[PDB]
């Protein structure tokens, strides 16, 4: 028994927390990402990068803490602790936003490790690896939003900050500057996510309301046995119900569950494609035909042109505070605004 | 050289449900992207 | 409205090409 196989045995033991070879990458990297985020949201400020308090130590709450993105002056520097910026000074590394790349990079490798874990466990137990394939969706989202978008932009500063209100800021920023709602790829993402939720709800309810009478209790949960060979609910009755209610119904269980995988995953992937576009400011910002007609015809108004106006207002009012490194100075009189407001 | 029948050839199938699903997908993609194609 | 001059042809082909792909495959099925 060579040392490699002895290690393989130890790593793949049946214990409370399976480790596996993938655990070597997953657990330290996941721990770094999670502990870095908790440490930043508890203790670390964004005063020097954003001019914002972003930790419990400064009086922020769960909704307003964040591991904020680094200062825009660093471009896409990876901001290693030992790098030319912090130069091994941990306190400075915290103050310049080193925690953001720390968390982002360890999270990316922890995500890799987790998908490798999915593969490893699927191989060990003897099933098909469709869980890893499904997890590719969240991976695409994380790569596109947290890595690809800022890499296309001027710096990590424009990456989403790891915090609740930081994420909301990123969301509103994308609306105002990129008109992300108008983007057909975001639209397909929305459809995928809403359809996934719909499928989850409808499938759970359908199963729960076509159950077979397999027990005597009003509590129907105890009339199932994991080793039972037969279906626990009536696919035939479910199909008839949905055919008569909605017009169509699933008749193939395998297709149903594959569809439940396919919908949200496809949605995540399409929205990731859209975010890649936004990284290069390749927006679906405008419909030129309506823009031209409005520029010539002062009576032409659509909801599209109204949304354009909202975006203009948001940009002008938010940019000075959202981009403090720019030293934007917008005198009050240049701010766009409607009457009386 | 001789021309021998290839024994690797297999039929392809698209059932009616798959037809309806694909046709709906294509129609809704067209609905989605036509406005942007026109701009 | 002054729309992109390729809009109609792009939309028609975007729909028609996969439509005919599906139609061919469906119709020949069972051969």
């Amino acid at each position: 028994r060579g040392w490699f196989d002895v290690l393989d045995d130890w790593l793949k033991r049946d214990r409370f927390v399976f480790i596996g070879w993938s655990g070597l990458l997953l657990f330290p990297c996941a721990f770094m990402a999670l502990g870095g985020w908790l440490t930043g949201t508890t203790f670390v400020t964004s005063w020097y990068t954003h001019g914002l308090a972003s930790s419990y130590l400064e009086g922020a709450n769960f909704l307003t803490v964040a591991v904020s993105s680094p200062a825009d002056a660093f471009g896409h520097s990876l901001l290693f602790l030992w790098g030319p910026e912090a130069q091994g000074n941990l306190t400075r590394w915290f103050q310049i936003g080193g925690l953001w790349p720390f968390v982002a990079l360890h999270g990316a490798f922890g995500l890799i490790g987790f998908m490798l874990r999915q593969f490893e466990i699927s191989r060990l137990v003897g099933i098909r690896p469709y869980n890893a394939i499904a997890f590719s969706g969240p991976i695409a989202v994380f790569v596109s939003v947290f890595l690809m978008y800022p890499l296309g932009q001027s710096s990590w500063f424009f990456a989403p900050s790891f915090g609740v209100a930081g994420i909301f800021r990123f969301i509103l920023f994308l609306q105002g500057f990129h008109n992300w709602t108008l983007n057909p790829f975001h639209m397909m993402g929305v459809a995928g996510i809403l359809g996934g939720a719909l499928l989850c709800a409808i499938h759970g309810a359908t199963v729960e309301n076509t159950l077979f009478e397999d027990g005597e209790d009003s509590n129907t949960f105890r009339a199932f046995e994991p080793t039972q060979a037969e279906e626990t609910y009536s696919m035939v009755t479910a199909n008839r119900f949905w055919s008569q209610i909605f017009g169509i119904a699933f008749s193939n269980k395998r297709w149903l569950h594959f569809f439940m995988l396919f919908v949200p995953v496809t949605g995540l992937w399409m929205s990731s494609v859209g975010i890649v576009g936004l990284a290069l400011n390749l927006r679906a910002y405008d419909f030129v035909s309506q823009e031209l007609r409005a520029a010539e015809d002062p009576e032409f108004e659509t909801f599209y042109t109204k949304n354009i106006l909202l975006n203009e207002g948001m940009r002008a009012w938010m940019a000075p505070q959202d981009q403090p490194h720019e030293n934007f100075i917008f005198p009050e009189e240049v701010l766009p605004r409607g009457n009386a407001l | 050289m001789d021309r021998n029948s290839n024994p690797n050839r297999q039929p392809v199938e698209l059932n009616r449900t798959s037809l309806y699903l694909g046709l709906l997908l294509v129609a809704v993609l067209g609905i989605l992207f036509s406005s942007y194609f026109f701009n | 409205m002054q729309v992109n001059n390729l809009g109609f042809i792009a939309s028609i082909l975007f729909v028609l090409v996969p439509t005919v792909f599906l139609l061919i495959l469906f119709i020949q099925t069972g051969k």
Binding site: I248, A249 | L23, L24 | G7
Partner: peptide
């Protein structure tokens, strides 16, 4: 004339719905 294209795609989608309902493959138990 782009209105014609929008109406066409919308009609195609609705027609697909009608056929998928009326002319569906019957679910059969066997």
């Amino acid at each position: 004339m782009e209105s014609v294209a929008y109406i066409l795609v919308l009609t195609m989608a609705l027609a697909v719905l009608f056929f998928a309902i009326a002319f569906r493959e019957p679910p059969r138990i066997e």
